[PDB]
Amino acid sequence: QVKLLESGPELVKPGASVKMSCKASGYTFTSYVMHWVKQKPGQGLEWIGYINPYNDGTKYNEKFKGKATLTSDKSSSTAYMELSSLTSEDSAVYYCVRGGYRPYYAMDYWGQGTSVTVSSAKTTPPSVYPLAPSMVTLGCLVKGYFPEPVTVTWNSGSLSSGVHTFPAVLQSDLYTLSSSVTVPSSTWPSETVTCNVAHPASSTKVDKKIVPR
Amino acid sequence: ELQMTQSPASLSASVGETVTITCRASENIYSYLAWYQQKQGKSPQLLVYNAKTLAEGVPSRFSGSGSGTQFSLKINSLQPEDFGSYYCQHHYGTPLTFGAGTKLELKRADAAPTVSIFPPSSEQLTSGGASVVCFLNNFYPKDINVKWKIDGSERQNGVLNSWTDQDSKDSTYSMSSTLTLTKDEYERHNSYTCEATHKTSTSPIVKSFNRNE
Numbered sequence: 001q002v003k004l005l006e007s008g009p010e011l012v013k014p015g016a017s018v019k020m021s022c023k024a025s026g027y028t029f030t031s032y033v034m035h036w037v038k039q040k041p042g043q044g045l046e047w048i049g050y051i052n053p054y055n056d057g058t059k060y061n062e063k064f065k066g067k068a069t070l071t072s073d074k075s076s077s078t079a080y081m082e083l084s085s086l087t088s089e090d091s092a093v094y095y096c097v098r099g100g101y102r103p104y105y106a107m108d109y110w111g112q113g114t115s116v117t118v119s120s121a122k123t124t125p126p127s128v129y130p131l132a133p134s135m136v137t138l139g140c141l142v143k144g145y146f147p148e149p150v151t152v153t154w155n156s157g158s159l160s161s162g163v164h165t166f167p168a169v170l171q172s173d174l175y176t177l178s179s180s181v182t183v184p185s186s187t188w189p190s191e192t193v194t195c196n197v198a199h200p201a202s203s204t205k206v207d208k209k210i211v212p213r
Numbered sequence: 214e215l216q217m218t219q220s221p222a223s224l225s226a227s228v229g230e231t232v233t234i235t236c237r238a239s240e241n242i243y244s245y246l247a248w249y250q251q252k253q254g255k256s257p258q259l260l261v262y263n264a265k266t267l268a269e270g271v272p273s274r275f276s277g278s279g280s281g282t283q284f285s286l287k288i289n290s291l292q293p294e295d296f297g298s299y300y301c302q303h304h305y306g307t308p309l310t311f312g313a314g315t316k317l318e319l320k321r322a323d324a325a326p327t328v329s330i331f332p333p334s335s336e337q338l339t340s341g342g343a344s345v346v347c348f349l350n351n352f353y354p355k356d357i358n359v360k361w362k363i364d365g366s367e368r369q370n371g372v373l374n375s376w377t378d379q380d381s382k383d384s385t386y387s388m389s390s391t392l393t394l395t396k397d398e399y400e401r402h403n404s405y406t407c408e409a410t411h412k413t414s415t416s417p418i419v420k421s422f423n424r425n426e
Contacts, residue, residue: 045257045300047309061308095256104304106247106262113256131331131346139331141344141391164350166375166389176373178389180329180348
């Protein structure tokens with residue numbers, strides 16, 4: 001089947017460049033153009049441009065001509081996008097998107113996307129704090145980390161229902177996130193409740209059991 | 214250049230209901246108009262192209278119509294899987310542009326929040342920080358106001374607020390509000406209150422604790 005493998009999250013400073021990849025399989029690479037599309041968090045879609053891998057030809061949105069550079073390597077079936085002179089306005093998810101048989105046909109296969117954060121803030125591990133009080137709500141506070149993401153689970157996934165994990169918020173260049181879990185009151189604290197926090201950018205994992213005060 | 218305008222920005226609707234969302238082009242695009250669906254956290258998917266042509270595997274309750282500058286997407290007898298965001302995009306040459314999107318959310322009856330308040334963990338207090346957390350869980354509609362008060366005075370500094378997307382099981386929203394203080398400011402006051410104003414009550418929901426209790 002048609003697959004588009006995109007490179008992982010990038011944290012880059014203002015003024016630098018970033019280059020991301022999109023390796024295609026499951027079709028004839030050179031028979032379809034590769035579009036790129038930008039999506040800022042909680043916002044709409046913006047077309048950047050495309051490359052035709054057959055002949056290395058490009059068409060850009062005028063707003064990205066001079067800023068984004070689209071290339072293509074036939075032998076590795078990989079399309080690339082480079083963005084230069086990065087600002088905080090370039091913080092977004094970038095998708096590669098295979099076009100149809102003609103460059104302007106509606107676009108059918110979107111990659112998963114590459115999330116780019118442009119910031120001068122330093123990679124910083126989370127502090128994790130427990131939130132202890134016929135249901136009872138418990139929580140975890142994941143504070144002072146950068147960049148995104150962190151993952152939170154409870155009892156390594158065995159507690160799945162009654163969970164709210166709130167989107168992170170940026171205060172003074174650090175993210176804070178909380179997660180709640182609501183369990184039957186009779187079961188706590190006799191059955192343990194642990195939050196598992198992973199921050200891959202700082203290569204950190206923290207398990208925090210929630211205990212009564 | 215070419216601008217696409219969608220309406221409405223947001224719409225609430227029930228499973229089994231029929232809705233119409235619209236898309237306007239600033240200049241003639243003939244029937245070269247596509248629709249994409251994007252569910253939260255996921256890549257967009259193509260639903261419709263050439264204004265009225267369904268993409269492969271799209272159910273027949275979806276129907277697009279229109280030509281020239283005025284377009285619409287009708288969803289007959291909505292199903293749970295239809296809720297999410299919808300984007301139109303002309304495909305009359307380049308550059309491609311998208312409408313800003315229509316967010317389609319589930320209607321349910323009003324529900325007051327379940328509010329839990331959490332004093333700072335003794336652990337965090339050892340670090341010099343003191344975060345007071347308030348969860349406001351499983352309410353509807355999404356509009357809500359939270360106020361923190363310390364010994365009766367509203368505190369606006371250092372409040373971090375975050376909302377979940379609509380819960381797919383029960384159609385409600387949740388909110389986390391975190392009031393961040395330094396430890397020594399926290400030890401100067403006794404009464405901490407989180408106060409939620411919501412459509413379901415004339416009177417705010419209030420959760421309070423006293424520091425030395």
